[PDB]
Amino acid sequence: ANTAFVSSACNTQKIPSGSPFNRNLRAMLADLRQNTAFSGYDYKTSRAGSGGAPTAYGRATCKQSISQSDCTACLSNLVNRIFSICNNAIGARVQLVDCFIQYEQRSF
Template sequence: MAFRRACRCLLLVSLALLPLGMAMDSIGSYCAGTSYAGSNKAVANINSVLADLVATGSSGGFATSTAGKGNNVIYGLAQCRGDVSASDCAACLSDAANQLPSTCSYSSDARIWYDYCFVRYENANFFGQSDTDAGVVLVNVQAEDNAKAFEKAVGKVMGKVTAQASAAGSAGLGRDKEQYTPFVSIYGLAQCTRDLAPLTCAQCLSTAVSRFGDYCGAQQGCQINYSSCRVRYEIYPFYFPLAGSGGGRATTDMTKYTKIVVHP
């Protein structure tokens, strides 16, 4: 698949995030290409791919699927965040598959991001390729006072989690934390889609982390979600098992974030 390198347009929107485990809402979507709404064959192929992704991805957290031939062929991918439960994964994929066709009006290239999962389909084969064009960025509006020290600590934890995620046998997931002050820890997560080879995963994550300087600065939390990898850090536990929660869900309300939708 030829990558699009035209220009990047940013749409900034204020966003209040609910506590984890409450309403499962999309954090962003991307729609491109032509609409297949008037093509019965293409619509049937899209619906078939999405149904297959939900059925096969719910148990293992990852799935790819294809349907159709020629101009009507559709390639699809679904992945859950590697730390979420099977039930949360299944619920997220089901909601994503239901929302994506209507959100994108059966576009030939459609993607939707959730906190717990990501679903995508396209009329071109993108399997195994790093894609850091379209994406969704969430940035905490609160910043740390000592920017240099905080960014250094963020870089340290993200270095650890990206190394974990790109290591062979890791299933593309890395999680860790770094002590910033005696009272504050920085929690980090990195993940690639499982169709990527370790080197391709490392390249995707390196690109994503390199853009922390563009978007995140010394903000107390930030996540960059691309189509083939995602990176995130916060100053509170957000990945499972939640530290100090006995394995339960997060109950603390998250502060307002800025949402940036990145278009190629």
Template sequence: MALVLKLFFFSLLLPLSYCADPIAHYCAQNYTSNQTQININQVISDLTTSASVGGFAVTSSGNGNDTIYGLAQCRGDVSASDCSACLSSAAKQFPVACPKQADARLWYDYCFMRYDTNNFVGQSDTGFVTILYNVQNATDPDAFDKAVRKLVKKANSDAVSAGSGSLGREKTNFTEYINIYALAQCTRDLQPLDCAQCLWSTLQYFPIYCSHRRGCRVLYTSCMVRYEIYPFYFPLDGNAKISGVDKYTKAILHPH
């Protein structure tokens, strides 16, 4: 019973996949063409259906300048039902977050969806980054940062290894009472080398935004990394110590 109650508490700490508001979004390219809107609607519908089955999908709709390309991916550790719920939330949110925008991207905790007039499939995109970092510092911060760097690098390596599905998960015992959890993921259209380069490039922001922080995540369009001191990926770690819910600050950058 104690284990069941602990897992239930952890589930309350995890973000809801069907939350109406994304954790990040990007919008660009105004349009007025009715055909573009029709193609966007078709792409969103196709992605929601196809990615709900396998956790990943790419598609396109239209011809010539009106063509819309799309991609959707769920986090590799979430269930099919959570994946489907997250994608449905994204589909409903696009008209609100990016009205009449032909380049639109939505990040949720459990999924990511985008569409664009350019065929981006298979190309690494690090031109937009969102960073979420915990406002609280870790105890023994220098040792904590060293442990985080080592753990995140292991998660990055896992994500580019054969058979990983572009997902890496790692855990380390920092102290008797504190575990650190890390997750890394690329969109599955990337080749392993492009995935590796994307993930390693996220580390440039760690000294600036994540140093000494109890949790941090860096979100690119093509990849993401995250670490926390509570279990946030599945399967949940039932032996973890509960630390409470922390607060985060967001930074949005346009490096290119």
């Protein structure tokens, strides 16, 4: 998939070192990545926090014109960069040419 970078908006506030929100966030993001191409190329999900971490609320979309396998390839690629693109923010939007991930500690 075209993985080239297009746009981002980041949260000015970052996830604390060792914070438990890292785990539910990434269980969350794992669902997006696994399930998006098979749930309409645009799909939302959420994971509750443990140990005082807020719920993680997520969204992922994919360019309707790419294959399902190609779509999970773009999302995996994006999950790999989104943490760099926004410096461990507690919230982020990142758009790649063929796919998009949003995540927040609040439903959106």
